[PDB]
Amino acid sequence: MTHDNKLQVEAIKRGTVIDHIPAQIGFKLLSLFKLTETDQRITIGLNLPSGEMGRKDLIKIENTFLSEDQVDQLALYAPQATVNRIDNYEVVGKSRPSLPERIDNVLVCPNSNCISHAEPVSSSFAVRKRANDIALKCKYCEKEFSHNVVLAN
Amino acid sequence: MTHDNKLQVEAIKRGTVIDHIPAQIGFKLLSLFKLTETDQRITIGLNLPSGEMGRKDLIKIENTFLSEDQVDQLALYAPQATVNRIDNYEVVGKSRPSLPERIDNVLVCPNSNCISHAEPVSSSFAVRKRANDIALKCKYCEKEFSHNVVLAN
Amino acid sequence: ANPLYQKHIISINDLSRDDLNLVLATAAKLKANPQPELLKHKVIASCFFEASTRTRLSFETSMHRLGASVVGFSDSANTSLGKKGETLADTISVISTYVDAIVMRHPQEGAARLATEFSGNVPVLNAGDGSNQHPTQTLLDLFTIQETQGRLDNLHVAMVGDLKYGRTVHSLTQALAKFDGNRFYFIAPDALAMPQYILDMLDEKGIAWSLHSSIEEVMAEVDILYMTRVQKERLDPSEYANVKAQFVLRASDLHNAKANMKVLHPLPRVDEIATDVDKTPHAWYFQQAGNGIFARQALLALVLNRDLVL
Amino acid sequence: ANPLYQKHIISINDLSRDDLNLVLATAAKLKANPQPELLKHKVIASCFFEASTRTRLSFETSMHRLGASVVGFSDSANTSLGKKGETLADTISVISTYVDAIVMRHPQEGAARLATEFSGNVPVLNAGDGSNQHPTQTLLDLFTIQETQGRLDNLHVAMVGDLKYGRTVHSLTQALAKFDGNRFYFIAPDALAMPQYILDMLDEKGIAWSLHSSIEEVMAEVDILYMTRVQKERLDPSEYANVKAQFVLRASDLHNAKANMKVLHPLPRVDEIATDVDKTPHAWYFQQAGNGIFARQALLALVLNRDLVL
Amino acid sequence: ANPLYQKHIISINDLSRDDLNLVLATAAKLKANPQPELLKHKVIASCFFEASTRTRLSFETSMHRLGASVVGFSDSANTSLGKKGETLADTISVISTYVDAIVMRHPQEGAARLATEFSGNVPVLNAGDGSNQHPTQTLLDLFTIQETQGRLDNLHVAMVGDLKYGRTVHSLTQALAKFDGNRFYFIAPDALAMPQYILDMLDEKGIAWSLHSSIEEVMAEVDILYMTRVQKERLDPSEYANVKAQFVLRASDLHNAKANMKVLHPLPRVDEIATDVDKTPHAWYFQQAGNGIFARQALLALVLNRDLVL
Amino acid sequence: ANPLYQKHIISINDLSRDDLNLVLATAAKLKANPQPELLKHKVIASCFFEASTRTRLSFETSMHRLGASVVGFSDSANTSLGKKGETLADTISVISTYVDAIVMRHPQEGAARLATEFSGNVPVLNAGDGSNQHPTQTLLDLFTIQETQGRLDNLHVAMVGDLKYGRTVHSLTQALAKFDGNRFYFIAPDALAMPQYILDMLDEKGIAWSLHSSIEEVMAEVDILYMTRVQKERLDPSEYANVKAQFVLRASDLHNAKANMKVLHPLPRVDEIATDVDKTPHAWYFQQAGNGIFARQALLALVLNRDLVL
């Protein structure tokens, strides 16, 4: 419980932290989840080395906490991401993303004839895990696809 | 010329630095100029106070330099931005953004009948400064607009 | 027999303040206490020589709501009347021997008036002649303003968009000008400004009005925000987009609006009112359209039923 | 209040076995004892953004049969909604302020579901979104099988033709799979076989099913012969004709059928069932269509009337 | 090799005064001494994505007058290109491997310019992108004025009609402003006035210009009476006719015209120039159209032939 | 007189290996040394009963490149032939008394063959009967492979996409099977696999071929990457997109391709080859289309000119 500050990583106080992010997934989380749309401070690190081999991405949002559902909404993009909460100028929480049962406002329906495209509604898909593949079902057209098809827009 | 560092600002060696960025202009520069699309390290700071009043944004890309034209391609978004170059683990260059004569691959033509929309070409506009307004002319339709109209897509 | 019994309703300008009040009152009452069999054994013709689904469903729904029967068409080469030889007169001379009333929309100005000279004791209601007098449209607008504002006098009205080719706005301005102390704010690009004959009319009556470049200037003092439809055709695609600036409404613009202010719009909307406005308390264009049912029910009631009570 | 009161009926898959039973029972009763004024003062919108005469006449007839009033359109450039700018949402947001219910068919999947989010307490019934969930179609099929077979369990069902692009069959297979002991026989050319996800579903429930090249193999043990529509487009004109072999039904094929076996077919028929089949006792596709009236009447009754008795 | 050899001709504003002079000079020479075999073994593509018979006939006739070969289309359900998805880019990337030159007209602005990035050493001549840069059209106007007036400097030019949407006049005004001492007279209804940016351009060059309500005011001192086309769409049928007053030319108005004054009109005429004008010596619109051949022949010669003499 | 003199060119399968070689040889020679007057005083009919701009422009351009004269049409409400009753026979019996050669495209299979029985010594070139035998199309593909690869034997060929309905690949596979030691790689979704009769033909000749799910597997050893067109109609919009996976080409996939590998595509492209491929050295589809001129010029020369030299 002290005041010893470092450098190669910015460890300010009071904020949610997203550690361990696959290469090229950090910027997407930013875009997809509108995480920069606020006045609270934000410290971002890209291509920063960490424990596990290779390179990764790091995101920190001062004075802002993510629910349980929100963290999970990262499973599809950052499955091995760590989300440490921070207060008291220290770690007061921690959790790992778990594949949700539903994903909204972020995916696009592969079906060109789906009503959701020209309409003022939020996209929505039902989730199901299976051998070498995630199945996403559209709330609207009720058509089902592999996440590898849905993430190739 | 020595080793001694600070936390409330990442000051790694070798790389271009974009200081003083209007609030909500940092994330756009990232998107608009595909700056995260590389393997080189990137340190981003958002809503960080500086020399002047009005929270700002900060961007730093290790081992990568911007030309003269590129820097200028920031005048329309970050007019009061400072772009300090860095090597020797210190400032080896510096320049401010000056309104270019051309702006490609980023703006969208407000004219819905312009051929550039459904086609595989890069957008392109001519720039002219004037009273309370910048005039952008499409390379293709040759129609002219105010930057306040072009940037309202 | 009420003053409007068996009368033709062609132009909003043929209606006196008393008539307007009479229609407006009947509408509130039919809305409060529905009367399903008022026009039980009546058969009304819905003749849409020119298609207009929204307005058609609205009128026809009104008809059924009063127990009336409906026959008609939404001509658009979907019928056999288009046979250019046959005159509108002859068509009305025939249809008027079949029904008890004629609700008609036509692409030509004066269609309904002419119909009046060939129907015979059979009243004709003007859906709308292209470009002239869409009666029931102004009545539903008026009815909606009265209900939300509680009155039609001493109001601050702003009309935005294409005020040059916007007949619903010409019609609504003239109607509101039959009430006292209203203040008008006209926001529109020079190329589509309010016609000079409208301003002359407002001057004759000493009615206050002023021009403004954007909604921001007035917002804080407007009770009614009437949003108009801007067709790209009246302009060049480059001219449109260009000027389209701030003549469109977004939730942002409503930060300092008055708690009672209501936003209205003849319903074809897009490129005018951002969907983020739909959730605010000011959005009232779907309610507006919803009132078309009562205003049109009221009109049919007064015209086809001698003495309607509460 | 019955379980389906004021509910939206969009996908056959959103209905529980209890719901199906409830609709099926109501239909038999309305068929035995007609109730002409059940929906007397109600106004229902028949919105066919996409034309479908047969289904339209069927739904609308159901409506009148219960005394309800109808307004709507069979859009196909015959209306003014097609104006591409305006969203389906905005259209439903308007029409839902006019009527008590919305029966709609649309060329796009999800149309009705979306409508549900913009109508408000006003229930929407899915005629059909192109390619997804035609509720009342499966309900009339089920109702027809139940009536002729006396039950929906322990039946031998054969489905012939284009099982790949046949939604009425995907829908009917899934529905019958909510009943026990049914045996399925799938007859179709490889290029149009039953989708693997349907077979997986039947496997999960341990339901017996097998593939067969022609109707001749099963005929002797089938209680229901569901004939599908094979559009030439899904194939090449040469491929069609070629394979069209024995996927068509002729009276000859019925020599050893079971006395109770019934032949069904979503009604667009030709190039599938020879007219010499119309006179046999097995032909039941016109009766099938005839049951659409009761199944759809039942649906409207349950949705718009709190507590319907016998 | 002449300055225009292998050059693309997209915008009039891309041509220097020398270029204009060079094209004009060549036209007069080809007109005086025809060269039928100049482009003998050449094949030119006449791609009219957007139909325009008069202009197409003119261009194509020019191609034959020079011996060139012609292939192409007028795309409006006349071809299979419209099929959506296939870009203009790909279309030009293909056609440009077939022909030696591409003359194209397209409904979208910037179509020819874009074509230039996909053709490859194969020159593209912009018939016209809808409402942007009709080069050959302005060149034929200039050639007509020079031939009838003997020069393009120190002239009195009157442009009447729809100066706001009249692209032929925006281009002609800019071309003429590249020459010295011209005096301009703009006659048009306020709602269709010459755009402010054209006037700004004229002020920059200190060129004299003035507005007038009718032709009568200037007639006595005009050398060129450029008559524009007034589409009814840019206005209301009532607004049209109404203002149509005196913006039309009749033989009467020509009583005090200068002997050398010529009347021009992009060719779609009617409701602008009364037939009684055709017989006067001033009428020159058909001669004008006649000059399109030489102006367009000249452009082709310079672009496809290295060094053309007299 | 060359072997193809005055011969009809209806089916690719009607041409012997010598014929192919002879056409290919001629094409290269005409390409190296153009002969603008070869068919000087000849008139050829370009009869496109079914529109096909690209192919028509290509053929017609070929006719002019040789000096021939051209008359014809693209029949789709563009002519008066469609008038029903008048047979194709009679149409050809007439036109064949006008011209020296008939190049035709028709929506029905066997149209060109039938034409041959009514033309009379006047040769008919089959542009294409819808989905049967597009001779010149295969000849231009072969000519492209031979020119880029230097031969048509012992090559590794990959065909991707809709191999079931892709007639250009059925023809190209059969043409290539007339040459020795070629290795074939068929990449496609099961629902659009190469027809069994093509594979049988390859087995008969002991030709090597294999199926693969994606291009990645073979890429490293392919000399020709033949990209096919995948119409959405042959499937369901959901089925399309879904399977569309990796059946599309992107510059990325080309990282380990052989230096000499060429990418081809009958020209309607989009949703198959990403534009980022256009800049690589492998992209050869526009060059491919470019070769249609020489292949079609060659066919015309051999058919209309007794003895053509180098």
Ligand SMILES: NC(=O)N[C@@H](CC(=O)O)C(=O)O
């Ligand atoms: N024709 C009209 O006057 N109105 C149309 C809307 C439209 O213009 O599309 C309607 O549906 O009401």
Ligand SMILES: NC(=O)N[C@@H](CC(=O)O)C(=O)O
């Ligand atoms: N459109 C449909 O879904 N059905 C049509 C039959 C047809 O396809 O012609 C009908 O009349 O019901």
Ligand SMILES: NC(=O)N[C@@H](CC(=O)O)C(=O)O
């Ligand atoms: N479309 C055009 O640009 N021109 C038409 C004239 C016309 O509009 O009728 C023509 O025939 O040249």
Ligand SMILES: NC(=O)N[C@@H](CC(=O)O)C(=O)O
């Ligand atoms: N119809 C055809 O056979 N070909 C079309 C291409 C297309 O289908 O768009 C063409 O332009 O060549």
Ligand SMILES: [Zn+2]
């Ligand atoms: Zn969907």
Ligand SMILES: [Zn+2]
């Ligand atoms: Zn543009």
